Design a protein around this ligand. Structure first.
Ligand SMILES: *[C@@H]1O[C@H](CO)[C@@H](O)[C@H](O)[C@H]1NC(C)=O
Lengths: 49, 49
């Protein structure tokens, strides 16, 4: 990984420690985007099975 | 009779100023106060965003 430009660091997001056995399926959705030089992102966490 | 002459509106008492913080915590500090500064021939950079 050579020619660098930017490097941002953050803690993990959208992850927990839950223990269950059954029907608990979840859906994760994001919005990747690139507008005005900013790779925008919109999200909506919707736990649903 | 009655004649609508003028209006007497209540003016704002003051103006409250403050910032909502938002994208914050700049590491910009660790630029001037550091150790092992490079030489003149050597080139260095530190992108901050
Ligand atoms: C380097 O020293 C200065 C002098 O007081 C002080 O601001 C701090 O300890 C260091 N600089 C930064 C930006 O943290």
């Amino acid at each position: 990984a050579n020619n660098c430009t930017f490097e941002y660091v953050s803690q993990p997001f959208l992850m927990d420690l839950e223990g269950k056995q059954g029907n608990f399926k979840n859906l994760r959705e994001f919005v990747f985007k690139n507008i005005d030089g900013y790779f925008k992102i919109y999200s909506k966490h919707t736990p649903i099975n | 009779g009655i004649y609508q002459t003028s209006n007497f509106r209540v003016q704002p008492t003051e103006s409250i100023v403050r910032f909502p913080n938002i994208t914050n915590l700049c590491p910009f500090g660790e630029v001037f106060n550091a150790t092992r500064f490079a030489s003149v021939y050597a080139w260095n950079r530190k992108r901050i965003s």
